[PDB]
Amino acid sequence: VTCNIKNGRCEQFCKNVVCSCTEGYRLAENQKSCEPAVPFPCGRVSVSQ
Amino acid sequence: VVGGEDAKPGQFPWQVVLNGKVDAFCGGSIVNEKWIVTAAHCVEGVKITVVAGEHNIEETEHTEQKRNVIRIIPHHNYNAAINKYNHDIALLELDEPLVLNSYVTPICIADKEYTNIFLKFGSGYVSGWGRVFHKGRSALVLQYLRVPLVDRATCLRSTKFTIYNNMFCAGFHEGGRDSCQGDSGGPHVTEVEGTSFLTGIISWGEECAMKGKYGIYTKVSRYVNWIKEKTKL
Ligand SMILES: Cc1ccc(-c2ncnc(Nc3ccc(C(=N)N)cc3)c2O)cc1
Numbered sequence: 001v002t003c004n005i006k007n008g009r010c011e012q013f014c015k016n017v018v019c020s021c022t023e024g025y026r027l028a029e030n031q032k033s034c035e036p037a038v039p040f041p042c043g044r045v046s047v048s049q
Numbered sequence: 050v051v052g053g054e055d056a057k058p059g060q061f062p063w064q065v066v067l068n069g070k071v072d073a074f075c076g077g078s079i080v081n082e083k084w085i086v087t088a089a090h091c092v093e094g095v096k097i098t099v100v101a102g103e104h105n106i107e108e109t110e111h112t113e114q115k116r117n118v119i120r121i122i123p124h125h126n127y128n129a130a131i132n133k134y135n136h137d138i139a140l141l142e143l144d145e146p147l148v149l150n151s152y153v154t155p156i157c158i159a160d161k162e163y164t165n166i167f168l169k170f171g172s173g174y175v176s177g178w179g180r181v182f183h184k185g186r187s188a189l190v191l192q193y194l195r196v197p198l199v200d201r202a203t204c205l206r207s208t209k210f211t212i213y214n215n216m217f218c219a220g221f222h223e224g225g226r227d228s229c230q231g232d233s234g235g236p237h238v239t240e241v242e243g244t245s246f247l248t249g250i251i252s253w254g255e256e257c258a259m260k261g262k263y264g265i266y267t268k269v270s271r272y273v274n275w276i277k278e279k280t281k282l
């Protein structure tokens with residue numbers, strides 16, 4: 001409903017709502033979440049921890 | 050890092066170490082396959098190598114990628130003769146691109162507004178191979194530590210030195226845990242739903258982990274447009 005309250009439910013970025021993600025991620029089917037669009041997207045740990 | 054923990058392999062894959070006349074003198078973060086972001090006081094002229102995919106600086110783990118630095122771009126407002134630690138941010142261009150994998154991955158950098166929102170979440174991770182004790186030797190295994198953000202008023206009362214508005218304070222009221230010399234240039238990152246974003250550059254401090262003192266960091270939000278511009282592939 002608005003980016004001022006809980007980021008418009010966007011996992012990363014919100015614009016008054018239209019959600020968006022950082023480079024290397026695409027907006028998921030739910031239009032809120034971010035999922036990898038490339039093999040090694042920025043800011044993610046992919047080795048077993 | 051004083052009072053931190055050993056990182057597991059691939060836990061901070063954006064971390065790099067800088068080697069020159071002395072190995073592990075500073076850290077950095079991977080912006081992309083050709084560019085590192087670090088502190089301007091770490092660099093200048095002086096030959097530097099960057100090692101990505103590093104974990105233990107004294108054991109070959111086969112995940113390391115060493116590169117020569119072909120260009121150093123300190124931010125144009127950096128001037129060591131006026132203030133060694135103000136506008137403390139620089140970019141390093143690598144001679145050949147790094148190969149991105151689970152051990153060598155870039156750090157995300159949000160726009161100016163969102164980088165500042167993420168810093169204000171109040172909890173970040175710092176890492177590096179700097180000193181593990183005040184006046185001690187640098188770490189063998191990469192160290193990490195979660196540091197809480199400290200309000201500007203508390204931070205101003207902690208020192209006689211000038212803390213500018215695009216510097217921030219992080220650490221513990223009682224000391225014991227902090228970044229230290231050898232960690233400068235390394236990352237201060239914030240986790241946003243499982244994705245880490247660069248919110249600060251490890252910059253300076255008076256001593257390390259002393260009660261009443263805090264680590265001083267460069268706010269990355271102040272430089273996002275300069276970083277995106279100079280590091281375009
Ligand atoms: C080429 C070069 C020139 C000078 C230095 C240098 N000299 C002194 N202190 C430094 N850093 C530092 C101190 C305290 C803390 C903290 N307590 N958070 C964090 C970082 C530092 O990087 C390093 C490289």
Ligand code: NA
Pocket residue numbers: 103104105106107108109110113
């Ligand atoms: Na190693």
